[PDB]
Amino acid sequence: NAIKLYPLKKLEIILEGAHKEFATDLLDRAGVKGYTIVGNLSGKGSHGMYEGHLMFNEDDALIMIIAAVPEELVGPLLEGFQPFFEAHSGVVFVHDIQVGRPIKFR
Amino acid sequence: AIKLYPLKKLEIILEGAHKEFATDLLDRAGVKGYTIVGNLSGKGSHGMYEGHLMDDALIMIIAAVPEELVGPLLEGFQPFFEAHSGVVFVHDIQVGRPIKFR
Amino acid sequence: IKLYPLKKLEIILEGAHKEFATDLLDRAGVKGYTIVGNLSGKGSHGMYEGHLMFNEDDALIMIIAAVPEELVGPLLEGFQPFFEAHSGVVFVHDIQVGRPIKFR
Numbered sequence: 001n002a003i004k005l006y007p008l009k010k011l012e013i014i015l016e017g018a019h020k021e022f023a024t025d026l027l028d029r030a031g032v033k034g035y036t037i038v039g040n041l042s043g044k045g046s047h048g049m050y051e052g053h054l055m056f057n058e059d060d061a062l063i064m065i066i067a068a069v070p071e072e073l074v075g076p077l078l079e080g081f082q083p084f085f086e087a088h089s090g091v092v093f094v095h096d097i098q099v100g101r102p103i104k105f106r
Numbered sequence: 107a108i109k110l111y112p113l114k115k116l117e118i119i120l121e122g123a124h125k126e127f128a129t130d131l132l133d134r135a136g137v138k139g140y141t142i143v144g145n146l147s148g149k150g151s152h153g154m155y156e157g158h159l160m161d162d163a164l165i166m167i168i169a170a171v172p173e174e175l176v177g178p179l180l181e182g183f184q185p186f187f188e189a190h191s192g193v194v195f196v197h198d199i200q201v202g203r204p205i206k207f208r
Numbered sequence: 209i210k211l212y213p214l215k216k217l218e219i220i221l222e223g224a225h226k227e228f229a230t231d232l233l234d235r236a237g238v239k240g241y242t243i244v245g246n247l248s249g250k251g252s253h254g255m256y257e258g259h260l261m262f263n264e265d266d267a268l269i270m271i272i273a274a275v276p277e278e279l280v281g282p283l284l285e286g287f288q289p290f291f292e293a294h295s296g297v298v299f300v301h302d303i304q305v306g307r308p309i310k311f312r
């Protein structure tokens with residue numbers, strides 16, 4: 001059979017774990033149907049270093065939030081995140097992806 | 107100067123309990139490698155998946171595969187995600203070494 | 209909110225060579241990077257079993273680097289001799305960002 005694929009976007013949101021609730025609140029408010037969080041990251045930015053812990057998930061961690069969302073949501077989400085990254089460390093990467101079940105993401 | 111070749115990349119997010127089923131399917135289809143990211147949390151349509159503080163309840167499998175494999179792989183994963191939690195993301199990527207992946 | 213085209217590298221390699229990789233990224237003028245640790249995987253020759261990994265040198269990492277298109281060629285050239293002799297892979301993605309100046 002033909003396995004049909006559909007267009008979606010995937011956001012990768014990298015920021016300090018201390019702001020996880022603000023971020024996931026924003027995602028929920030915008031109507032994102034799910035998200036995945038990768039913790040204990042390291043990284044280098046324009047100003048500071050984040051050393052990933054070698055034993056546990058500490059509170060002052062760097063995290064990445066992965067969120068697959070319909071095209072129509074990208075614009076409003078970035079506007080929502082605009083004041084945040086205007087104020088805080090981190091980045092947003094927008095990807096084009098394909099998924100098998102459009103309804104799962106709306 | 108440095109030539110690139112087209113490939114597809116799958117991100118397969120699912121419960122750690124099913125790691126072997128997932129990797130068996132990738133292997134059977136002839137996937138030459140994959141990467142498993144542990145220590146995840148997440149929110150789904152019905153529940154929260156809380157990551158451990160130190161084992162891996164939710165995982166993400168990254169698998170770069172030739173285009174010809176995507177169909178067969180999705181067929182393999184269809185009955186699974188029909189019954190179980192998780193998602194598959196298909197990406198277009200580029201790589202430098204085509205034979206490393208087929 | 210305008211979006212702009214960029215590339216994103218996913219660089220998977222052994223943790224023992226992390227400094228080599230990050231030095232190369234820094235030297236080439238890459239403005240930032242993010243490292244995902246504690247990875248396991250299956251490679252061309254062997255299995256990298258996470259439970260069998262105990263040192264940071266033996267573990268796999270994934271370095272995520274968002275970079276302008278013009279930087280990709282020279283970066284892959286720098287990594288070319290490394291991956292001839294060492295394990296790991298590089299995935300090149302198309303992405304979009306909002307603050308192009310942040311990445312140059």
Ligand SMILES: Nc1ncnc2c1ncn2[C@@H]1O[C@H](COP(=O)(O)OP(=O)(O)O)[C@@H](O)[C@H]1O
Pocket residue numbers: 014015042043044045046047048049050062088089090091238239240241242243272273274275311
């Ligand atoms: N170009 C990039 N590619 C990948 N990750 C990045 C990039 N720039 C920043 N990051 C991630 O975001 C974090 C925040 O960096 P940045 O936004 O420059 O804040 P600061 O000014 O405090 O360093 C970095 O430590 C890194 O993990």
Ligand SMILES: Nc1ncnc2c1ncn2[C@@H]1O[C@H](COP(=O)(O)OP(=O)(O)O)[C@@H](O)[C@H]1O
Pocket residue numbers: 032033034035036037066067068069105119120147148149150151152153154155164190191192193
């Ligand atoms: N839109 C999404 N973006 C990113 N990750 C997602 C998305 N939807 C689901 N996931 C990941 O898959 C996991 C399972 O989701 P789901 O299959 O909806 O579980 P549930 O049984 O709770 O409905 C989530 O915890 C999340 O980590």
Ligand SMILES: Nc1ncnc2c1ncn2[C@@H]1O[C@H](COP(=O)(O)OP(=O)(O)O)[C@@H](O)[C@H]1O
Pocket residue numbers: 137138139140141142168169170171207220221248249250251252253254255256268294295296297
């Ligand atoms: N097709 C692939 N998709 C995703 N990750 C891969 C793939 N091939 C290799 N990798 C990642 O790179 C690691 C090293 O692979 P490889 O260079 O083939 O190792 P070796 O040749 O030393 O056995 C793997 O363990 C995996 O994490």
